[PDB]
Amino acid sequence: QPIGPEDVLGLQRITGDYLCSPEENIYKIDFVRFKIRDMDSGTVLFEIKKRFVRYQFTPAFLRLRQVGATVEFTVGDKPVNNFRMIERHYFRNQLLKSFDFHFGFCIPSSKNTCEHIYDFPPLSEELISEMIRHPYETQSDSFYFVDDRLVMHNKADYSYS
């Protein structure tokens, strides 16, 4: 019954449903800032401050190599150990790449900040072209674990057109 990291690390496609309910966020983890920036140029690509998101990017996005994600979040009454996210990006259900970010320990009622780095998988001119030409068939699942137990699940899709 409890979903762990090794379960999601084998996923063959975007999940057809959410693997948990909003009520399984018993730690009351609450994101209050999310920012991604291009590591080459230093440019901010997207910032949001204070379970599905659709992004609309340009073709140039697909030529990035490395992107930094800063996150700020608060936690409620219980301590949070080994907070971790595994986020899997697919095109038409073929894995593009799976990222695995560790956030560590958070004391109760804290706000915490981390920055992690996405390294792009290698993409071929064919693949890119297909990606540009098929908006929103690139999708991602974000799986959030506390102490190896799934507590949140967010979905996203992407256009590069």
């Binding site: 609450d30 994101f31 209050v32 800032r33 999310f34 997207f46 949001i48 401050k49 204070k50 379970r51 599905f52 998101v53 992004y55 994600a69 996150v71 996210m85 986020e87 991602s140 699942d141 974000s142 949140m152 967010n154 979905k155 996203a156």
Partner: peptide
């Protein structure tokens, strides 16, 4: 995906 949560 984390942007969903704000």
């Amino acid at each position: 995906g984390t942007a969903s949560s704000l």
